[PDB]
Enzyme design. Structure first.
Site, PDB file in Angstrom:
ATOM      1  NE  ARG A 241      -3.546  -2.523   0.027  1.00 46.60           N
ATOM      2  CZ  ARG A 241      -3.173  -3.712  -0.428  1.00 46.60           C
ATOM      3  NH1 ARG A 241      -1.969  -3.907  -0.944  1.00 46.60           N
ATOM      4  NH2 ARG A 241      -4.027  -4.729  -0.368  1.00 46.60           N
ATOM      5  CE1 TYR A 242       3.388   6.084   3.296  1.00 44.52           C
ATOM      6  CE2 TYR A 242       5.660   5.353   3.474  1.00 44.52           C
ATOM      7  CZ  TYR A 242       4.706   6.339   3.612  1.00 44.52           C
ATOM      8  OH  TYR A 242       5.071   7.586   4.067  1.00 44.52           O
TER       9      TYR A 242
END
Lengths: 477, 477
Positions: free
Chosen positions: B84-85
């Site tokens: 996600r990051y």
């Protein structure tokens, strides 16, 4: 004010389609476009205040369709639900009749920070400044005014527009002398009580039922603009009146009003001997606080800025009418001014096809000498995309930027546009829009004021939307 | 397989612009369009496996630009960060050179459920089936293969394309007899060790440094495809070798490899007297497990379906070349077939202007008799929006649906398109694209195979992207 900012939100957001939208989502759309910087909470409470639909609400005719329950008459609209869960739907049928779409292009728009802003005042078909009660859109100060019925203002506006009313010149006679012979009475919707007039104030009174057979006192109707919970606590404040009250139990409910009051008959013979025996009204409505003092507070926005106070509601209706009457003239003249430009543009294109490959050839069109050579050809140098698509332009500004226009409406057409069948549709477009010019030319020439006939149709259109909304389950369909 | 499904995601999603995008957001885009139904977790671990950039990774040249840290050689890429990051960026410079954009329109696409699906196999400039090590895109079974260097396949492909190489016919001679005189060696990137060949297997060995002055053993390089943490635990399993190991402490770090080993010299004289004194290699790399057995496992996707096994990597490069070589011929012939249709369409429009209002008039064009009357006028009935915008159409299908086309490319033009200046740009468009036709006609006629000259330029373009990526900080700019 901020109410008019929300008004442009419904038409702009729902221009593509009129569907169900969340209140907060619509609020975000309004602040995004018209720059509402007072906060979403102030916007959301203003939207509900604009879309409130209950007896005693300030807004009798909401701009949007009421969805779900926004409260009840008990708390006076202060019991609104969660804004996130509830939805809002624009009433397309009413809003176009109440506010004409074509008139919006002519409304006086102010410009702030190099961008368009909402008009200072709107001029709808029926005056929204009298049909609605006073409220508190802001905090701290609350405006207090009472709405008139939908039968006296209608008779007044039809008297100033339709010539068939015998009291047409009578109304005009009253304008100069300020005598105001015509009547004007407060709203009577959802109030099965009484209204009484002494001096220069009105007072609303409820209805009570007394039965000798059962010795039970029944209260039927509440005063005009009182919340139900206010009367519960107000009667408990007076210690003197509490002694006579053995017990009061409220049996009233939503959509069914029936209150049973148990009062001992021995208290009926001694209330009247110490309340001075008022002759203006009976002691039943004196001991019970079923009256309110109507102190007429009138506020109207000044065209030049500020607030004005009028001694009576007549000075408001007699002042709102000319501004609406004046802009009917401007609406027809501008539409007259754009149809005659459309005839010039369309006829030139139609006659261009005659000087197209049918008869003559002028395809060379060097950009240097096309200026004055085509001038004797009769082709007008009017700019395109303006006549076909009018904008927020006044009559004076329209002619300046149309005569000093530009080309590319000519010799940039599709090759099929000069075909034989295309000219027939193009030339027949002139006469259909020529006939519409004749009717407008036939209009705007009456002795009282221009656009009198269209006013009556617009008045009836507003009545149709209001009747259909009330006849149905507030669905307008 | 699933790798090619992700390949179309980068070009389609970043067709508008090549910016920074989240891995999961890109994964959602890929499954939305190409119908990835194996789950986002399988898609996300495949994206990282496709975009892994570390020594020992299966993918030497990632499709996308590596952003941040996806791990290290210690765990062998199993220490990836949070999807996600982290973000993903398509390498536009490499992907267009490695996979030509114009060749994508001709690639064999399969159709599933009435919709297009990704091709069974791709035919890029350089074979991706040999340049990358084996991996485990799925779970359970892991494919094991070793990549070749970027100097032997380049010499082999240039030998089969460029005529200037003296060993051109020598390579062609080796094709028929399957003798494979040319060499082919494994990858040597980021491995400062040794590679030794006996029989039919390879073995990778590390490098150790021994200093007599300080009596400290130093290990320099690890084996080719070993994680660092694997060697830590493997040496602890053997109880016999643990007695000789008094202590091992790892001092190696990222981007700086330096390991200090403290071993007593008295153990050096007795290790060799009980390890049979192997003569193939020294006992230092025998006692320390610094070797791995390379069991060549070769898998290539069958064009008709299934898997095939080859005894050597030569049979893969000698089989990948003809399929790429064949489609070079089809790419030029299709582009030749569309330029000649463009000349017919453009010349007809140019000559239409001559028979426009300049000289002749034929504006009547009744839809009934325009069929054969215009046939003698020389105007071809070819459908528009196909020549100017080619699609996934083969050469055979292109001619069938172009000759039996339709009108509206004629007499639907803008009125300015038949102006004098417009014809000059229209007629000069023919000769510029006529000259391009001549070069293509001059091509596709060489004795070895069509499109030999363009192959060398495409090979160099791939080398330019690889060099620029490594020369810079993997930014391609």
């Amino acid at each position: 004010r901020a109410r008019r900012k929300i008004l442009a939100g419904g038409v702009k957001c729902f221009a593509s389609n009129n569907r169900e939208r969340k209140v907060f989502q619509f609020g975000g759309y309004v602040a995004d476009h018209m720059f509402y910087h007072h906060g979403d909470m102030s916007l959301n409470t203003s939207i509900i205040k604009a879309a409130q639909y209950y007896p005693g609400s300030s807004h009798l005719y909401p701009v949007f369709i009421g969805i779900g329950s926004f409260g009840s008459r008990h708390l006076g609209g202060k019991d609104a639900g969660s804004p996130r869960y509830i939805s809002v739907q624009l009433a397309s049928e009413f809003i176009k009749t109440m506010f004409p779409a074509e008139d919006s292009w002519l409304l006086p728009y102010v410009f702030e920070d190099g961008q368009r802003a909402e008009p200072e005042y709107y001029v709808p078909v029926l005056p929204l400044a009298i049909m609605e009660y006073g409220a508190n859109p802001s905090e701290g100060w609350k405006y207090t005014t009472w709405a008139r019925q939908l039968e006296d203002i209608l008779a007044l506006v039809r008297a100033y527009v339709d010539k068939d009313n015998p009291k047409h010149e009578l109304l005009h006679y009253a304008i100069k002398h300020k005598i105001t012979i015509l009547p004007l009475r407060p709203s009577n919707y959802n109030f099965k009580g009484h209204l009484k007039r002494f001096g220069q104030y009105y007072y609303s009174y409820g209805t009570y039922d007394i039965s000798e057979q059962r010795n039970i006192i029944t209260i039927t109707e509440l005063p005009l603009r009182v919340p139900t919970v206010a009367y519960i606590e107000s009667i408990k404040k007076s210690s003197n009146r509490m002694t006579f009250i053995e017990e009061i139990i409220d049996y009233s409910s939503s959509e069914t009003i029936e209150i049973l009051v148990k009062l001992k008959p021995n208290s009926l013979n001694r209330i009247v001997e110490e309340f001075k025996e008022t002759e203006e009204q009976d002691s039943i409505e004196n001991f019970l606080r079923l009256r309110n003092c109507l102190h007429s507070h009138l506020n109207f926005v000044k065209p030049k800025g500020g607030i004005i106070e009028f001694n009576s509601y007549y000075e408001i209706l007699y002042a709102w009418l000319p501004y609406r009457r004046e802009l009917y003239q401007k609406r027809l003249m501008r539409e007259h001014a754009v149809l005659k430009l459309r005839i010039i543009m369309e006829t030139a294109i139609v006659r261009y096809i005659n000087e197209s490959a049918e008869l003559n050839l002028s395809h060379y069109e060097d950009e240097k000498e096309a200026s004055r050579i085509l001038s004797e050809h009769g082709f007008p140098p009017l700019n395109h995309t303006l006549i076909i698509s009018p904008e927020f332009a006044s009559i004076e500004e329209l002619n300046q930027k149309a005569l000093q226009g530009c080309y590319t409406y000519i010799l940039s057409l599709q090759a099929r546009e000069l075909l034989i069948a295309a000219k027939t549709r193009r030339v027949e477009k002139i006469k259909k829009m020529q006939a519409r010019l004749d009717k407008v030319e036939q209009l705007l020439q009456e002795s009282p004021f221009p656009g009198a006939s269209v006013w009556l149709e617009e008045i009836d259109a507003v009545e149709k939307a209001i009747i259909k909304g009330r006849n149905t389950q507030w669905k307008f369909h």
